């Protein structure tokens, strides 16, 4: 029932909105917030996270962003579920990442409403993908 | 004591974070939210707003964005106080707008913390400007 989530975005107001929304959901606990994928990857093993909710465009020299970062996480944290926050519904972008077998895609600007629904889907072992 | 504010930004999550923060302040009421300066300007006369909190980069063909939009508002709503939300502390950008005698500048990403402080300053008839 309880789900521990990490949220990662290089915009502090995105993290604020997401935390405010998730604080309304009894069974979701935010166990970390990051703005850089190096900090993320460095601290990931230390947090008993179930789901990573992440932007694909953050700073991170060591491990990268986008597809490169996803590949890194899938290999090194293979049971960590991943929800991608996307700035748009670009057909090509989605494809690349959906092929990697991530669990969810949410339009970033709708995250406070849509994340709770994506996380409920995940809890049922189902994927969530924008309309 | 009571302050009615309009918030304007083309990013729905920015508006969400700001509303969540201002809902903690008894004496501040959000009377409107906009994502386009045409909608803003069209509905401004209809809302008994004291302060406009606005991004400078929103869509708006009719009345514009940035300096052009500020000039429009200063002329047509000359007692409306304006707080600009800025994506950065660029020395040049700030100058241009500070010369127009606006009341506040807040770094957008810090708005949930900083706005309450900017609005308290405004209430004392003082300006608020990032560090």
UniProtKB/Swiss-Prot annotation, chains A, B:
Activity regulation statement: Activity is modulated by phosphorylation and interaction with other transcriptional regulators. Probably up-regulated by YmgA/AriR, and possibly down-regulated by YcgZ, all 3 are connector proteins providing additional signal input into the signaling system.
Top-level taxon of the source organism: Bacteria
Name this polypeptide is given: Transcriptional regulatory protein RcsB
Subunit structure: Interacts with RcsD and RcsA. Homodimer. Can form an heterodimer with the coactivator RcsA, which binds to the RcsAB boxes to promote transcription of RcsA-dependent genes. Can also form a heterodimer with GadE to bind to the GAD box, and with BglJ to bind to the bgl promoter.
Function noted in UniProt: Component of the Rcs signaling system, which controls transcription of numerous genes. RcsB is the response regulator that binds to regulatory DNA regions. Can function both in an RcsA-dependent or RcsA-independent manner. The system regulates expression of numerous genes, including genes involved in colanic acid capsule synthesis, biofilm formation, cell division and outer membrane proteins synthesis. Also involved, with GadE, in control of glutamate-dependent acid resistance, and, with BglJ, in derepression of the cryptic bgl operon.
Other remarks in the entry: There is a close linkage between the Rcs and PhoQ/P signaling systems, and both signaling systems respond to certain external divalent cations (zinc and magnesium).
Post-translational note: Phosphorylated and activated by RcsD.
Gene Ontology cellular-component annotations: cytosol; transcription regulator complex
Effect seen on changing residue 55 to E: Increases heterodimer formation with RcsA. Does not affect heterodimer formation with BglJ
Induction of synthesis: Expression is dependent on the alternate sigma factor, RpoN. Repressed by hydroxyurea.
Location of the Response regulatory domain: 4-123
Membership in a protein family: Belongs to the RcsB family.
GO BP, sorted A to Z: cellular stress response to acidic pH; DNA-templated transcription; negative regulation of DNA-templated transcription; phosphorelay signal transduction system; positive regulation of cell projection organization; positive regulation of DNA-templated transcription; regulation of bacterial-type flagellum-dependent cell motility; regulation of capsule organization
GO molecular function: DNA binding; DNA-binding transcription activator activity; DNA-binding transcription repressor activity; identical protein binding
Keyword ATP-binding: no
Parent-protein start and end of this portion: 2 to 132 of 216
Keyword Transcription regulation annotated: yes
Record key words, sorted: Activator, Capsule biogenesis/degradation, DNA-binding, Phosphoprotein, Transcription, Transcription regulation, Two-component regulatory system
Gene that produces this protein: rcsB
Residues modified as 4-aspartylphosphate: 55
């Amino acid at each position: 029932n309880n789900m521990n989530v990490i949220i990662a975005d290089d915009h502090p107001i995105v993290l604020f909105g997401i935390r405010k929304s998730l604080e309304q959901i009894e069974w979701v606990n935010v166990v970390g917030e990051f703005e850089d994928s190096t900090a993320l990857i460095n601290n990931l093993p230390k947090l008993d996270a179930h789901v990573l909710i992440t932007d694909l465009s953050m700073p991170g020299d060591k491990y990268g962003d986008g597809i490169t970062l996803i590949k890194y996480i899938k290999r090194h944290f293979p049971s960590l579920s991943i929800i991608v926050l996307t700035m748009n519904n670009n057909p090509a972008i989605l494809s690349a990442v959906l092929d990697l077998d991530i669990e969810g895609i949410v339009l970033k600007q709708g995250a406070p409403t849509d994340l709770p629904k994506a996380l409920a889907a995940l809890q049922k072992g189902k994927k969530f993908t924008p309309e």
